[PDB]
Amino acid sequence: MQAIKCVVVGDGAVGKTCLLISYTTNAFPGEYIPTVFDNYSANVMVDGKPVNLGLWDTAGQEDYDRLRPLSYPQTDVFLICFSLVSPASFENVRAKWYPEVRHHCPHTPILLVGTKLDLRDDKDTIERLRDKKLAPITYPQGLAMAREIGSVKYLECSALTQRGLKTVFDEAIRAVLG
Amino acid sequence: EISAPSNFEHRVHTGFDQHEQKFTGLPRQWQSLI
Ligand SMILES: Nc1nc2c(ncn2[C@@H]2O[C@H](COP(=O)(O)OP(=O)(O)CP(=O)(O)O)[C@@H](O)[C@H]2O)c(=O)[nH]1
Ligand SMILES: [Cl-]
Ligand SMILES: [Cl-]
Ligand SMILES: [Mg+2]
Protein backbone atom coordinates (compact mmCIF):
# COMPACT_ATOMS: atom_id res chain seq x y z
CA MET A 1 0.00 0.00 0.00
CA GLN A 2 1.22 3.52 -0.78
CA ALA A 3 1.97 5.52 2.36
CA ILE A 4 2.32 9.30 2.98
CA LYS A 5 4.08 10.94 5.92
CA CYS A 6 2.46 14.31 6.53
CA VAL A 7 3.91 16.40 9.37
CA VAL A 8 1.93 19.28 10.94
CA VAL A 9 3.62 22.35 12.59
CA GLY A 10 2.85 25.88 13.81
CA ASP A 11 2.42 28.07 16.88
CA GLY A 12 0.67 27.11 20.08
CA ALA A 13 -3.09 27.59 20.07
CA VAL A 14 -3.37 27.63 16.25
CA GLY A 15 -5.60 24.54 15.83
CA LYS A 16 -3.30 21.72 14.54
CA THR A 17 -4.78 18.99 16.71
CA CYS A 18 -8.40 20.02 16.12
CA LEU A 19 -7.67 20.08 12.37
CA LEU A 20 -6.23 16.53 12.39
CA ILE A 21 -8.84 15.07 14.75
CA SER A 22 -11.76 16.79 12.99
CA TYR A 23 -10.63 15.41 9.60
CA THR A 24 -9.90 11.86 10.76
CA THR A 25 -12.69 11.31 13.29
CA ASN A 26 -15.25 14.02 12.41
CA ALA A 27 -15.28 15.31 15.96
CA PHE A 28 -14.10 18.71 17.23
CA PRO A 29 -12.25 18.10 20.51
CA GLY A 30 -14.17 19.69 23.40
CA GLU A 31 -11.09 20.48 25.52
CA TYR A 32 -7.99 22.51 24.65
CA ILE A 33 -5.08 20.22 25.59
CA PRO A 34 -1.64 21.12 24.25
CA THR A 35 0.31 18.33 22.45
CA VAL A 36 3.75 16.91 23.30
CA PHE A 37 3.65 14.56 20.28
CA ASP A 38 1.05 12.28 18.66
CA ASN A 39 0.97 10.04 15.59
CA TYR A 40 -2.28 9.12 13.86
CA SER A 41 -2.98 6.88 10.89
CA ALA A 42 -6.00 6.74 8.58
CA ASN A 43 -6.84 5.05 5.29
CA VAL A 44 -7.95 7.01 2.23
CA MET A 45 -8.97 5.71 -1.21
CA VAL A 46 -7.16 7.68 -3.91
CA ASP A 47 -8.22 7.01 -7.50
CA GLY A 48 -9.45 3.54 -6.52
CA LYS A 49 -6.18 2.68 -4.71
CA PRO A 50 -5.88 2.54 -0.92
CA VAL A 51 -3.34 4.93 0.65
CA ASN A 52 -2.06 4.94 4.21
CA LEU A 53 -2.02 8.47 5.57
CA GLY A 54 0.41 8.93 8.52
CA LEU A 55 -0.11 12.15 10.47
CA TRP A 56 2.55 13.63 12.72
CA ASP A 57 1.00 16.10 15.22
CA THR A 58 3.76 18.25 16.66
CA ALA A 59 4.11 20.66 19.60
CA GLY A 60 3.70 24.38 19.05
CA GLN A 61 5.20 24.86 22.50
CA GLU A 62 8.65 26.31 22.29
CA ASP A 63 9.57 24.16 25.32
CA TYR A 64 9.39 21.14 23.00
CA ASP A 65 11.68 22.64 20.34
CA ARG A 66 14.24 19.84 20.75
CA LEU A 67 11.65 17.01 20.43
CA ARG A 68 10.00 18.47 17.31
CA PRO A 69 12.70 17.73 14.63
CA LEU A 70 12.68 14.03 15.47
CA SER A 71 9.47 13.90 13.37
CA TYR A 72 11.12 15.39 10.28
CA PRO A 73 13.26 12.71 8.65
CA GLN A 74 11.61 11.19 5.53
CA THR A 75 8.61 13.58 5.63
CA ASP A 76 6.60 13.68 2.36
CA VAL A 77 4.67 16.90 3.02
CA PHE A 78 4.38 19.60 5.65
CA LEU A 79 1.38 21.55 6.72
CA ILE A 80 2.51 24.85 8.22
CA CYS A 81 -0.48 26.26 10.06
CA PHE A 82 -1.31 29.66 11.56
CA SER A 83 -4.60 31.06 12.94
CA LEU A 84 -6.40 33.48 10.67
CA VAL A 85 -7.17 35.48 13.87
CA SER A 86 -3.62 35.52 15.32
CA PRO A 87 -1.29 37.88 13.41
CA ALA A 88 1.56 36.69 15.61
CA SER A 89 1.12 33.04 14.54
CA PHE A 90 1.13 34.23 10.94
CA GLU A 91 4.29 36.32 11.41
CA ASN A 92 5.86 33.13 12.87
CA VAL A 93 5.41 31.29 9.55
CA ARG A 94 8.19 33.54 8.21
CA ALA A 95 10.12 33.93 11.50
CA LYS A 96 10.20 30.30 12.74
CA TRP A 97 8.27 27.50 10.97
CA TYR A 98 9.40 27.84 7.36
CA PRO A 99 13.11 28.19 8.38
CA GLU A 100 12.99 25.22 10.79
CA VAL A 101 11.20 22.93 8.35
CA ARG A 102 13.39 23.93 5.42
CA HIS A 103 16.57 23.51 7.46
CA HIS A 104 15.68 19.87 8.14
CA CYS A 105 13.91 19.09 4.83
CA PRO A 106 15.33 21.36 2.09
CA HIS A 107 13.07 20.02 -0.73
CA THR A 108 9.88 18.68 0.90
CA PRO A 109 6.67 20.38 -0.26
CA ILE A 110 4.96 22.78 2.20
CA LEU A 111 1.22 23.60 2.25
CA LEU A 112 0.37 26.84 4.08
CA VAL A 113 -2.82 26.40 6.11
CA GLY A 114 -4.88 29.19 7.68
CA THR A 115 -7.05 27.84 10.47
CA LYS A 116 -10.10 29.07 12.46
CA LEU A 117 -11.84 30.50 9.37
CA ASP A 118 -15.12 30.55 11.33
CA LEU A 119 -13.62 33.32 13.52
CA ARG A 120 -12.51 35.75 10.75
CA ASP A 121 -16.03 37.19 10.69
CA ASP A 122 -16.67 36.87 14.44
CA LYS A 123 -17.45 40.50 15.46
CA ASP A 124 -16.09 40.02 19.03
CA THR A 125 -12.86 38.57 17.71
CA ILE A 126 -12.59 41.45 15.23
CA GLU A 127 -13.19 43.98 18.05
CA ARG A 128 -10.59 42.49 20.44
CA LEU A 129 -8.08 42.29 17.58
CA ARG A 130 -8.84 45.96 16.78
CA ASP A 131 -8.31 46.78 20.51
CA LYS A 132 -4.75 45.43 20.24
CA LYS A 133 -4.07 47.25 16.93
CA LEU A 134 -4.61 44.03 14.92
CA ALA A 135 -6.85 42.55 12.26
CA PRO A 136 -7.57 39.09 10.97
CA ILE A 137 -5.37 37.83 8.15
CA THR A 138 -7.15 37.98 4.77
CA TYR A 139 -6.96 35.50 1.85
CA PRO A 140 -4.62 37.78 -0.23
CA GLN A 141 -2.32 38.20 2.77
CA GLY A 142 -2.27 34.44 3.34
CA LEU A 143 -1.62 33.83 -0.37
CA ALA A 144 1.24 36.37 -0.39
CA MET A 145 2.89 34.60 2.57
CA ALA A 146 2.47 31.22 0.80
CA ARG A 147 4.12 32.53 -2.34
CA GLU A 148 7.00 33.98 -0.35
CA ILE A 149 7.79 30.62 1.34
CA GLY A 150 7.42 28.73 -1.94
CA SER A 151 4.37 26.77 -0.76
CA VAL A 152 2.61 24.49 -3.22
CA LYS A 153 -0.79 25.60 -1.96
CA TYR A 154 -2.46 28.10 0.33
CA LEU A 155 -5.61 26.77 2.01
CA GLU A 156 -8.06 28.18 4.57
CA CYS A 157 -10.26 25.98 6.79
CA SER A 158 -12.21 25.60 10.00
CA ALA A 159 -11.80 22.42 12.09
CA LEU A 160 -15.02 23.44 13.89
CA THR A 161 -17.29 23.73 10.84
CA GLN A 162 -15.12 21.51 8.55
CA ARG A 163 -15.43 24.14 5.81
CA GLY A 164 -12.42 23.64 3.55
CA LEU A 165 -11.15 20.84 5.80
CA LYS A 166 -11.14 17.80 3.46
CA THR A 167 -9.49 19.97 0.78
CA VAL A 168 -6.43 20.58 2.99
CA PHE A 169 -5.76 16.84 3.15
CA ASP A 170 -6.83 16.12 -0.43
CA GLU A 171 -4.29 18.75 -1.61
CA ALA A 172 -1.60 17.39 0.75
CA ILE A 173 -2.19 13.98 -0.80
CA ARG A 174 -2.10 15.28 -4.41
CA ALA A 175 1.12 17.18 -3.52
CA VAL A 176 2.86 13.88 -2.72
CA LEU A 177 1.16 11.39 -5.08
CA GLY A 178 0.08 13.65 -7.98
CA GLU B 1 -11.16 11.07 -6.64
CA ILE B 2 -10.15 11.12 -2.96
CA SER B 3 -12.41 9.49 -0.39
CA ALA B 4 -13.14 10.49 3.18
CA PRO B 5 -10.62 9.02 5.64
CA SER B 6 -11.40 5.77 7.49
CA ASN B 7 -9.97 3.38 10.11
CA PHE B 8 -8.37 6.02 12.32
CA GLU B 9 -5.58 4.74 14.56
CA HIS B 10 -3.72 6.55 17.30
CA ARG B 11 -0.33 4.92 16.98
CA VAL B 12 1.74 7.05 19.33
CA HIS B 13 0.74 9.21 22.32
CA THR B 14 3.71 11.03 23.88
CA GLY B 15 3.73 12.87 27.22
CA PHE B 16 6.19 14.49 29.57
CA ASP B 17 6.82 13.78 33.24
CA GLN B 18 7.89 16.89 35.17
CA HIS B 19 9.22 14.91 38.19
CA GLU B 20 11.84 13.00 36.16
CA GLN B 21 12.07 15.51 33.28
CA LYS B 22 11.58 12.59 30.90
CA PHE B 23 9.31 11.98 27.96
CA THR B 24 6.79 9.19 28.20
CA GLY B 25 5.41 7.01 25.35
CA LEU B 26 8.15 7.97 22.88
CA PRO B 27 8.17 6.33 19.42
CA ARG B 28 10.45 3.32 19.85
CA GLN B 29 12.87 4.79 17.27
CA TRP B 30 13.33 8.02 19.32
CA GLN B 31 14.38 6.30 22.55
CA SER B 32 18.08 6.28 21.50
CA LEU B 33 17.84 9.90 20.27
CA ILE B 34 16.19 11.63 23.28
N1 LIG C 1 -13.28 28.62 16.65
C1 LIG C 1 -12.37 27.67 16.35
N2 LIG C 1 -11.56 27.31 17.34
C2 LIG C 1 -10.63 26.37 17.12
C3 LIG C 1 -10.53 25.75 15.79
N3 LIG C 1 -9.53 24.86 15.85
C4 LIG C 1 -9.05 24.91 17.11
N4 LIG C 1 -9.71 25.79 17.87
C5 LIG C 1 -9.45 26.13 19.28
O1 LIG C 1 -8.11 26.60 19.34
C6 LIG C 1 -7.45 26.14 20.53
C7 LIG C 1 -6.23 25.30 20.13
O2 LIG C 1 -6.59 24.12 19.39
P1 LIG C 1 -5.51 22.91 19.26
O3 LIG C 1 -6.03 22.07 18.11
O4 LIG C 1 -5.25 22.31 20.60
O5 LIG C 1 -4.21 23.73 18.81
P2 LIG C 1 -2.76 23.10 18.59
O6 LIG C 1 -2.16 23.94 17.50
O7 LIG C 1 -2.80 21.58 18.44
C8 LIG C 1 -1.92 23.54 20.14
P3 LIG C 1 -0.32 22.71 20.41
O8 LIG C 1 0.58 23.15 19.29
O9 LIG C 1 0.08 23.21 21.77
O10 LIG C 1 -0.77 21.27 20.37
C9 LIG C 1 -8.53 25.40 21.29
O11 LIG C 1 -9.21 26.30 22.20
C10 LIG C 1 -9.49 24.93 20.22
O12 LIG C 1 -10.80 24.66 20.71
C11 LIG C 1 -11.45 26.21 14.75
O13 LIG C 1 -11.41 25.72 13.60
N5 LIG C 1 -12.31 27.14 15.09
CL1 LIG D 1 0.97 29.25 -3.90
CL1 LIG E 1 -12.83 27.97 1.95
MG1 LIG F 1 -2.06 20.04 19.53
mmCIF file of C-alpha atoms and ligand atoms in Angstrom:
data_model
loop_
_atom_site.group_PDB
_atom_site.id
_atom_site.type_symbol
_atom_site.label_atom_id
_atom_site.label_comp_id
_atom_site.label_asym_id
_atom_site.label_seq_id
_atom_site.Cartn_x
_atom_site.Cartn_y
_atom_site.Cartn_z
ATOM 1 C CA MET A 1 0.000 0.000 0.000
ATOM 2 C CA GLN A 2 1.215 3.522 -0.780
ATOM 3 C CA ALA A 3 1.972 5.518 2.363
ATOM 4 C CA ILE A 4 2.319 9.300 2.979
ATOM 5 C CA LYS A 5 4.081 10.942 5.921
ATOM 6 C CA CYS A 6 2.462 14.310 6.525
ATOM 7 C CA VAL A 7 3.914 16.400 9.372
ATOM 8 C CA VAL A 8 1.925 19.280 10.943
ATOM 9 C CA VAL A 9 3.624 22.346 12.586
ATOM 10 C CA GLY A 10 2.849 25.882 13.812
ATOM 11 C CA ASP A 11 2.423 28.070 16.880
ATOM 12 C CA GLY A 12 0.671 27.112 20.077
ATOM 13 C CA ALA A 13 -3.088 27.594 20.072
ATOM 14 C CA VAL A 14 -3.368 27.627 16.245
ATOM 15 C CA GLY A 15 -5.598 24.536 15.833
ATOM 16 C CA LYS A 16 -3.305 21.717 14.540
ATOM 17 C CA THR A 17 -4.780 18.992 16.709
ATOM 18 C CA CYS A 18 -8.400 20.023 16.119
ATOM 19 C CA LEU A 19 -7.666 20.083 12.368
ATOM 20 C CA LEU A 20 -6.230 16.526 12.394
ATOM 21 C CA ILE A 21 -8.837 15.067 14.753
ATOM 22 C CA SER A 22 -11.762 16.787 12.993
ATOM 23 C CA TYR A 23 -10.632 15.414 9.597
ATOM 24 C CA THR A 24 -9.899 11.864 10.761
ATOM 25 C CA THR A 25 -12.688 11.310 13.289
ATOM 26 C CA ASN A 26 -15.251 14.018 12.408
ATOM 27 C CA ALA A 27 -15.285 15.310 15.962
ATOM 28 C CA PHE A 28 -14.104 18.707 17.230
ATOM 29 C CA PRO A 29 -12.252 18.100 20.513
ATOM 30 C CA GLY A 30 -14.167 19.693 23.397
ATOM 31 C CA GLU A 31 -11.094 20.483 25.520
ATOM 32 C CA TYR A 32 -7.995 22.505 24.646
ATOM 33 C CA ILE A 33 -5.083 20.216 25.594
ATOM 34 C CA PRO A 34 -1.636 21.123 24.245
ATOM 35 C CA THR A 35 0.312 18.329 22.455
ATOM 36 C CA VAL A 36 3.752 16.914 23.303
ATOM 37 C CA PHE A 37 3.648 14.557 20.280
ATOM 38 C CA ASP A 38 1.054 12.279 18.658
ATOM 39 C CA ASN A 39 0.972 10.038 15.587
ATOM 40 C CA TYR A 40 -2.284 9.121 13.862
ATOM 41 C CA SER A 41 -2.978 6.880 10.892
ATOM 42 C CA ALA A 42 -6.005 6.735 8.584
ATOM 43 C CA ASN A 43 -6.838 5.052 5.291
ATOM 44 C CA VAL A 44 -7.950 7.010 2.232
ATOM 45 C CA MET A 45 -8.974 5.708 -1.212
ATOM 46 C CA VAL A 46 -7.157 7.680 -3.910
ATOM 47 C CA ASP A 47 -8.218 7.007 -7.504
ATOM 48 C CA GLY A 48 -9.447 3.538 -6.517
ATOM 49 C CA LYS A 49 -6.184 2.676 -4.707
ATOM 50 C CA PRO A 50 -5.881 2.538 -0.917
ATOM 51 C CA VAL A 51 -3.342 4.926 0.646
ATOM 52 C CA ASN A 52 -2.061 4.943 4.211
ATOM 53 C CA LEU A 53 -2.018 8.471 5.565
ATOM 54 C CA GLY A 54 0.409 8.930 8.516
ATOM 55 C CA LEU A 55 -0.114 12.153 10.466
ATOM 56 C CA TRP A 56 2.549 13.634 12.719
ATOM 57 C CA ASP A 57 1.004 16.102 15.222
ATOM 58 C CA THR A 58 3.761 18.254 16.662
ATOM 59 C CA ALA A 59 4.113 20.656 19.598
ATOM 60 C CA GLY A 60 3.702 24.378 19.046
ATOM 61 C CA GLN A 61 5.197 24.862 22.501
ATOM 62 C CA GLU A 62 8.652 26.314 22.290
ATOM 63 C CA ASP A 63 9.569 24.155 25.315
ATOM 64 C CA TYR A 64 9.392 21.138 23.000
ATOM 65 C CA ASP A 65 11.677 22.638 20.338
ATOM 66 C CA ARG A 66 14.241 19.840 20.749
ATOM 67 C CA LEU A 67 11.647 17.006 20.427
ATOM 68 C CA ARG A 68 10.001 18.467 17.312
ATOM 69 C CA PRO A 69 12.698 17.734 14.626
ATOM 70 C CA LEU A 70 12.678 14.029 15.469
ATOM 71 C CA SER A 71 9.468 13.901 13.374
ATOM 72 C CA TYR A 72 11.119 15.394 10.282
ATOM 73 C CA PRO A 73 13.258 12.710 8.646
ATOM 74 C CA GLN A 74 11.612 11.195 5.525
ATOM 75 C CA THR A 75 8.607 13.579 5.629
ATOM 76 C CA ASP A 76 6.601 13.684 2.364
ATOM 77 C CA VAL A 77 4.671 16.900 3.025
ATOM 78 C CA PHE A 78 4.385 19.596 5.649
ATOM 79 C CA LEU A 79 1.377 21.551 6.718
ATOM 80 C CA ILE A 80 2.511 24.853 8.223
ATOM 81 C CA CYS A 81 -0.478 26.263 10.056
ATOM 82 C CA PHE A 82 -1.312 29.656 11.557
ATOM 83 C CA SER A 83 -4.602 31.059 12.945
ATOM 84 C CA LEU A 84 -6.402 33.480 10.668
ATOM 85 C CA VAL A 85 -7.172 35.485 13.867
ATOM 86 C CA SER A 86 -3.621 35.516 15.323
ATOM 87 C CA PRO A 87 -1.286 37.879 13.405
ATOM 88 C CA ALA A 88 1.555 36.690 15.610
ATOM 89 C CA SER A 89 1.118 33.037 14.539
ATOM 90 C CA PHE A 90 1.133 34.226 10.942
ATOM 91 C CA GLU A 91 4.295 36.321 11.414
ATOM 92 C CA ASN A 92 5.864 33.134 12.865
ATOM 93 C CA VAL A 93 5.408 31.286 9.546
ATOM 94 C CA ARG A 94 8.190 33.536 8.207
ATOM 95 C CA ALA A 95 10.118 33.929 11.498
ATOM 96 C CA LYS A 96 10.202 30.304 12.741
ATOM 97 C CA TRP A 97 8.275 27.501 10.971
ATOM 98 C CA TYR A 98 9.402 27.835 7.356
ATOM 99 C CA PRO A 99 13.113 28.191 8.376
ATOM 100 C CA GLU A 100 12.993 25.225 10.785
ATOM 101 C CA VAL A 101 11.202 22.925 8.348
ATOM 102 C CA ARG A 102 13.388 23.928 5.423
ATOM 103 C CA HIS A 103 16.569 23.514 7.464
ATOM 104 C CA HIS A 104 15.685 19.872 8.139
ATOM 105 C CA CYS A 105 13.912 19.095 4.829
ATOM 106 C CA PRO A 106 15.327 21.363 2.091
ATOM 107 C CA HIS A 107 13.072 20.019 -0.727
ATOM 108 C CA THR A 108 9.876 18.683 0.896
ATOM 109 C CA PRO A 109 6.672 20.383 -0.258
ATOM 110 C CA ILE A 110 4.962 22.778 2.197
ATOM 111 C CA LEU A 111 1.220 23.600 2.249
ATOM 112 C CA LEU A 112 0.365 26.844 4.085
ATOM 113 C CA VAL A 113 -2.816 26.400 6.111
ATOM 114 C CA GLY A 114 -4.878 29.189 7.682
ATOM 115 C CA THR A 115 -7.047 27.839 10.475
ATOM 116 C CA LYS A 116 -10.097 29.068 12.462
ATOM 117 C CA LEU A 117 -11.845 30.498 9.371
ATOM 118 C CA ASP A 118 -15.124 30.551 11.329
ATOM 119 C CA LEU A 119 -13.620 33.318 13.517
ATOM 120 C CA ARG A 120 -12.508 35.746 10.749
ATOM 121 C CA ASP A 121 -16.030 37.193 10.691
ATOM 122 C CA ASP A 122 -16.674 36.874 14.441
ATOM 123 C CA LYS A 123 -17.448 40.499 15.456
ATOM 124 C CA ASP A 124 -16.093 40.019 19.029
ATOM 125 C CA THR A 125 -12.862 38.572 17.708
ATOM 126 C CA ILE A 126 -12.586 41.450 15.234
ATOM 127 C CA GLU A 127 -13.187 43.982 18.055
ATOM 128 C CA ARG A 128 -10.592 42.495 20.444
ATOM 129 C CA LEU A 129 -8.082 42.294 17.578
ATOM 130 C CA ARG A 130 -8.837 45.955 16.779
ATOM 131 C CA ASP A 131 -8.311 46.784 20.507
ATOM 132 C CA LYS A 132 -4.747 45.429 20.242
ATOM 133 C CA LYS A 133 -4.073 47.254 16.926
ATOM 134 C CA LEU A 134 -4.610 44.033 14.916
ATOM 135 C CA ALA A 135 -6.853 42.553 12.257
ATOM 136 C CA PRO A 136 -7.573 39.090 10.968
ATOM 137 C CA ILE A 137 -5.366 37.829 8.153
ATOM 138 C CA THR A 138 -7.154 37.977 4.772
ATOM 139 C CA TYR A 139 -6.963 35.500 1.848
ATOM 140 C CA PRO A 140 -4.624 37.777 -0.229
ATOM 141 C CA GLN A 141 -2.317 38.202 2.771
ATOM 142 C CA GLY A 142 -2.266 34.436 3.340
ATOM 143 C CA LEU A 143 -1.618 33.828 -0.366
ATOM 144 C CA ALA A 144 1.238 36.366 -0.388
ATOM 145 C CA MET A 145 2.890 34.605 2.569
ATOM 146 C CA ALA A 146 2.465 31.220 0.805
ATOM 147 C CA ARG A 147 4.118 32.533 -2.342
ATOM 148 C CA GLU A 148 7.000 33.980 -0.347
ATOM 149 C CA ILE A 149 7.789 30.620 1.335
ATOM 150 C CA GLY A 150 7.418 28.728 -1.938
ATOM 151 C CA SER A 151 4.374 26.766 -0.758
ATOM 152 C CA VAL A 152 2.612 24.491 -3.217
ATOM 153 C CA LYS A 153 -0.788 25.599 -1.963
ATOM 154 C CA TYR A 154 -2.460 28.103 0.331
ATOM 155 C CA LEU A 155 -5.612 26.773 2.014
ATOM 156 C CA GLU A 156 -8.056 28.184 4.571
ATOM 157 C CA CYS A 157 -10.264 25.976 6.787
ATOM 158 C CA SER A 158 -12.210 25.597 9.997
ATOM 159 C CA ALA A 159 -11.796 22.420 12.092
ATOM 160 C CA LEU A 160 -15.019 23.443 13.890
ATOM 161 C CA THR A 161 -17.289 23.731 10.836
ATOM 162 C CA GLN A 162 -15.125 21.514 8.550
ATOM 163 C CA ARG A 163 -15.434 24.136 5.806
ATOM 164 C CA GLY A 164 -12.420 23.644 3.547
ATOM 165 C CA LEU A 165 -11.146 20.843 5.802
ATOM 166 C CA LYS A 166 -11.139 17.797 3.462
ATOM 167 C CA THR A 167 -9.488 19.967 0.784
ATOM 168 C CA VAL A 168 -6.430 20.578 2.986
ATOM 169 C CA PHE A 169 -5.763 16.836 3.151
ATOM 170 C CA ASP A 170 -6.826 16.123 -0.428
ATOM 171 C CA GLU A 171 -4.291 18.747 -1.607
ATOM 172 C CA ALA A 172 -1.602 17.391 0.754
ATOM 173 C CA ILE A 173 -2.189 13.979 -0.802
ATOM 174 C CA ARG A 174 -2.100 15.283 -4.412
ATOM 175 C CA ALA A 175 1.121 17.182 -3.518
ATOM 176 C CA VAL A 176 2.862 13.879 -2.716
ATOM 177 C CA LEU A 177 1.158 11.389 -5.083
ATOM 178 C CA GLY A 178 0.077 13.654 -7.978
ATOM 179 C CA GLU B 1 -11.156 11.067 -6.640
ATOM 180 C CA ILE B 2 -10.155 11.124 -2.965
ATOM 181 C CA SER B 3 -12.411 9.487 -0.385
ATOM 182 C CA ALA B 4 -13.143 10.488 3.179
ATOM 183 C CA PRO B 5 -10.620 9.016 5.641
ATOM 184 C CA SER B 6 -11.398 5.768 7.489
ATOM 185 C CA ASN B 7 -9.970 3.382 10.113
ATOM 186 C CA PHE B 8 -8.374 6.018 12.321
ATOM 187 C CA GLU B 9 -5.579 4.738 14.557
ATOM 188 C CA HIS B 10 -3.725 6.549 17.298
ATOM 189 C CA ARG B 11 -0.331 4.919 16.983
ATOM 190 C CA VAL B 12 1.742 7.049 19.335
ATOM 191 C CA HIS B 13 0.740 9.211 22.320
ATOM 192 C CA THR B 14 3.713 11.026 23.883
ATOM 193 C CA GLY B 15 3.726 12.865 27.222
ATOM 194 C CA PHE B 16 6.194 14.495 29.571
ATOM 195 C CA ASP B 17 6.818 13.781 33.239
ATOM 196 C CA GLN B 18 7.891 16.894 35.174
ATOM 197 C CA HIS B 19 9.224 14.914 38.187
ATOM 198 C CA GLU B 20 11.845 13.002 36.162
ATOM 199 C CA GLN B 21 12.073 15.510 33.283
ATOM 200 C CA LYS B 22 11.583 12.592 30.903
ATOM 201 C CA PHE B 23 9.306 11.983 27.957
ATOM 202 C CA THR B 24 6.793 9.188 28.199
ATOM 203 C CA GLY B 25 5.411 7.007 25.354
ATOM 204 C CA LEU B 26 8.153 7.967 22.881
ATOM 205 C CA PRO B 27 8.172 6.333 19.424
ATOM 206 C CA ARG B 28 10.450 3.320 19.848
ATOM 207 C CA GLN B 29 12.869 4.794 17.274
ATOM 208 C CA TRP B 30 13.332 8.018 19.319
ATOM 209 C CA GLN B 31 14.376 6.296 22.546
ATOM 210 C CA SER B 32 18.076 6.280 21.496
ATOM 211 C CA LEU B 33 17.841 9.900 20.269
ATOM 212 C CA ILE B 34 16.189 11.632 23.284
HETATM 213 N N1 LIG C 1 -13.281 28.623 16.650
HETATM 214 C C1 LIG C 1 -12.374 27.671 16.347
HETATM 215 N N2 LIG C 1 -11.556 27.307 17.344
HETATM 216 C C2 LIG C 1 -10.631 26.366 17.119
HETATM 217 C C3 LIG C 1 -10.526 25.746 15.794
HETATM 218 N N3 LIG C 1 -9.533 24.859 15.848
HETATM 219 C C4 LIG C 1 -9.050 24.907 17.112
HETATM 220 N N4 LIG C 1 -9.710 25.793 17.870
HETATM 221 C C5 LIG C 1 -9.449 26.130 19.284
HETATM 222 O O1 LIG C 1 -8.106 26.597 19.339
HETATM 223 C C6 LIG C 1 -7.445 26.136 20.527
HETATM 224 C C7 LIG C 1 -6.233 25.302 20.133
HETATM 225 O O2 LIG C 1 -6.590 24.119 19.391
HETATM 226 P P1 LIG C 1 -5.514 22.908 19.256
HETATM 227 O O3 LIG C 1 -6.032 22.065 18.114
HETATM 228 O O4 LIG C 1 -5.253 22.306 20.597
HETATM 229 O O5 LIG C 1 -4.209 23.730 18.806
HETATM 230 P P2 LIG C 1 -2.762 23.099 18.590
HETATM 231 O O6 LIG C 1 -2.160 23.940 17.499
HETATM 232 O O7 LIG C 1 -2.797 21.584 18.435
HETATM 233 C C8 LIG C 1 -1.917 23.542 20.144
HETATM 234 P P3 LIG C 1 -0.322 22.706 20.413
HETATM 235 O O8 LIG C 1 0.582 23.150 19.293
HETATM 236 O O9 LIG C 1 0.080 23.209 21.769
HETATM 237 O O10 LIG C 1 -0.767 21.267 20.373
HETATM 238 C C9 LIG C 1 -8.526 25.396 21.295
HETATM 239 O O11 LIG C 1 -9.210 26.295 22.205
HETATM 240 C C10 LIG C 1 -9.488 24.935 20.219
HETATM 241 O O12 LIG C 1 -10.801 24.657 20.708
HETATM 242 C C11 LIG C 1 -11.452 26.208 14.748
HETATM 243 O O13 LIG C 1 -11.408 25.718 13.599
HETATM 244 N N5 LIG C 1 -12.314 27.144 15.094
HETATM 245 CL CL CL C 2 0.966 29.253 -3.895
HETATM 246 CL CL CL C 3 -12.831 27.973 1.948
HETATM 247 MG MG MG C 4 -2.058 20.037 19.533
#
